[PDB]
Amino acid sequence: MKFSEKWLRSWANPQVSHDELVARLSMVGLEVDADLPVAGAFSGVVVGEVLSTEQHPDADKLRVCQVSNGSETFQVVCGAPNVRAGLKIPFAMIGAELPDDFKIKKAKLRGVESFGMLCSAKELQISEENAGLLELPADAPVGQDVRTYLELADYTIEVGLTPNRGDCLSLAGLAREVSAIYDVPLAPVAVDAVAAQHDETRPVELAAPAACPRYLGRVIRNVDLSRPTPLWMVERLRRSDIRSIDPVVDVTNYVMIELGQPMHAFDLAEINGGVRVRMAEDGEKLVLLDGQEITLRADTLVIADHQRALAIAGVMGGEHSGVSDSTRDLFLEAAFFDTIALAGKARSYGLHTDSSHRFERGVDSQLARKAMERATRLILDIVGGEPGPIVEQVSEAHLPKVAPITLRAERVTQMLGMPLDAAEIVRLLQALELTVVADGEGQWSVGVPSHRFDISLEVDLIEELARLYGYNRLPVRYPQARLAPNNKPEARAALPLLRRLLVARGYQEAITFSFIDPALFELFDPGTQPLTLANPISADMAAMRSSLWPGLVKALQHNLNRQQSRVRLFESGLRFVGQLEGLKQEAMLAGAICGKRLPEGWANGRDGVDFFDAKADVEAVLASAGALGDFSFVPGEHPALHPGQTARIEREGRLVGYLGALHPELAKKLDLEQPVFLFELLLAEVVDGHLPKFRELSRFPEVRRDLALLVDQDVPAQDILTQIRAAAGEWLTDLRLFDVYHGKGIDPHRKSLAVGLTWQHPSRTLNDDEVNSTTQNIVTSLEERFNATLR
């Protein structure tokens, strides 16, 4: 909402400077978005009158004019194509200071003496109209300072209104606030009833009184629509960001911006048998004044005649019913439309107007009549004509009525953290035009004025009090709490814990978009239909991810293309699996690595990362809550991964996730030349651990035995290690695979597994006989289960 401060101050003057007013406005809940001067600075410019013009005898593009300042006649040489006798213009006398340090001096232009200059709006920084001289009203006061006359000592304040302050969508609304804020007299425009000159009316029917409980209509005969909108109105509208279009629209707009009442004028000749305020028929067609052809719905209120719809009630007029050049007679409209009935209606047709906005936000239900009289007077002043009587059709039953609210002083003290005096409370609420009647000790019955649509509860009253008292003047307290000692279980691996572990283990944390390209989704999840957005921002951001991998891989190659060799990234976030019916939204921890195993350094080996580097990272995470043993890495397969280098991770047979090298074919497709290692873990299956259960420490020495085992190249190492543990007896304290050999010294389809077996008895020393005995049973077990051999 934009406005001229001068015009506001003509209703309620705060008696403080501009800066003070703009500051306070935001502090009371009307945030100022801009405060700008209406024009540039200048002095010595008065209203001048061109008495005569003559053709300059030595330059055809120039004229020799006689101009009066109401005190004296000066010869001014002018080259503007519009300079003519009778014209009221800004006369810059000798000595006048114009913008950008332009001082008017004496001149002898092509042998002719000039005692001043006549100006354009551009020259004065009034408008950008340099086409010619700023033509002032025929009735301008000759000699008066142009800044005084054109009200140039002014600013335009723009307020970013909140949806609850629809009442502030006018100068009337804004001036009421200022009067409340500053406890100053409010002087509203006195609107005298315009007396009917004739008896011509048009009947008005309220076919939908619940959607329009009040409608006012007036016949204005023999209007001259060729006449121009006066400057004061153009300036007031302009200073509110309303561009002048035609005299009749300008006044209905002016009345709206001045008082808050949106109004509409029809060409009386386009009204067949009077007005019918009714709902549209399903598929009723109406062409708007902007040319748009709307196909209406039964839920939409229209202003119609006895033949057809004329306008979409409170939003926009029709082309046919509206004023044209041929218009000689008017039918003025000022009505109240219910906010609930109008909510979202303009939007549903892809429309938004100053009228639709004010009606949706709320228009004072009692205002139509003052607005009607005001617009009548302005129409007669601007375009003439003869007014008939006002036809008021009202439905008392459907008029908005808010029940009085009881405000308790204790409730204000409680909420504000301090008591307010009864006199202060009454003063403040009455300033906002609320009706405050005492209802015993520290209680009142308060009534809501017709312009306010946000007040129905006791808390809304407290809000108003806090707002005008000053939010920053209110006390500061910290909330009381009966708090008890508490904690989460000890044996759990939380995500903040895991993140820091990954950090320590050389990972950088990435955050990628949850919605990816469906084509990317298809690469990592082939037969799966993603959960696809109905209104995606772009089509390459349409699919909800079922893996953090496409996004991580994409961030990895983003870096690779940016001169990065070693990219170690991790992300945590939701996975979206299935369609709405059955959708699983699971938190995942995923990681992606590439490049050298170690950073470049004098002390570091130049080996590239592999599977087993990523494996250690997963192991470290999986052991974070002392439950590593609960997990198993089984040879598995995943479409995004290399089938020869993929591990399916399980806990009690349930799937934890996957670990593996990104599939070489996927890499080809993505133009990725480096091997990439991925892992993804379902956080729900990682968080639980086990509390340490102490096992007694032996006072006796441990015994170690090393075994070199020849096995088929394809038999899994963990299958052998599991068999060894099962056959080692009760005293085995440690089992270590310290080497794997797949060389020339043995068969090309076999491998040697060098294992270290440690035993410790808790109550004595172990003898060589029993240990050799246990060792042979391990071997025997591996001979029968894997056809193993000692090297």
């Binding site: 409680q414 809000e463 939010y471 919605f515 979206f576 709405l580």
Partner: protein, 217 residues
């Protein structure tokens, strides 16, 4: 992490919810009527008529109010989504929302909480300003400003919003507004991170360039 720590040290529980939400939890339960412009496809990402990507973490606070009776002290950090994006705004971002519902909560309590949080967060005894604003879920409501003592490039800045929980919001989630009062607050994580670390362009957050990331080790 930092925002959570300011409250978890004082009894606030960290609450999480789903990112794919329903219109009841995301809008209706928060006093946002069916005809409200926030619900439109110009601002909200939809799957169907009822299912969407959450516009805030407020639904988490709703799910908490339904699950338990007061006292409630929660902080809700999370990924949130908005349709109307380009520069200055991303389709995905992070925010932390707060909720305290007890027997005798005031606007003075809210001011104290917010002012001390900001002081704690920015590690300065900075000036805090409360400006009246509006939200369907809170009444009274405020936009919170702090001085430019943390720059606009390393005299006030809007950093967060808050307000007293609306009676209808409590009522809808079986909390009696006569017995229980409450306050809520909201803030954008990226905005805060930008203020803290001197990050100029918001788009650096989702590119994951190592040259950006490495600077926060």
């Amino acid at each position: 992490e930092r925002i959570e720590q300011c409250f978890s040290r004082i009894g606030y529980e960290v609450a999480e919810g789903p990112e794919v939400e329903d219109d009841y939890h995301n809008f209706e339960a928060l006093n946002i009527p069916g005809h409200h412009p926030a619900r439109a496809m110009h601002d909200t990402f939809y799957f169907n008529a009822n299912m969407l990507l959450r516009t805030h973490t407020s639904p988490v606070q709703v799910r908490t109010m339904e699950s338990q009776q007061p006292p409630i002290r929660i902080v809700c950090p999370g990924r949130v989504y908005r349709c109307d994006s380009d520069l200055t705004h991303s389709p995905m971002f992070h925010q932390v929302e707060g909720l305290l519902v007890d027997e005798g909560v005031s606007f003075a309590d809210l001011k104290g909480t917010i002012e001390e949080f900001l002081r704690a967060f920015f590690e300065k005894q900075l000036e805090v300003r409360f400006r009246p604003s509006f939200f369907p879920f809170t009444e009274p409501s405020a936009e919170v400003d702090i001085q430019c003592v943390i720059c606009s490039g390393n005299g006030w800045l809007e950093v967060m919003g808050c307000g007293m929980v609306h009676p209808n919001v409590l009522r809808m989630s079986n909390i009696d507004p006569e017995k229980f009062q409450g306050f809520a607050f909201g803030m954008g994580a990226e905005r805060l991170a930008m203020l803290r670390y001197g990050v100029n362009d918001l788009r650096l957050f989702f590119d994951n360039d190592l040259r950006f990331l490495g600077q926060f080790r």
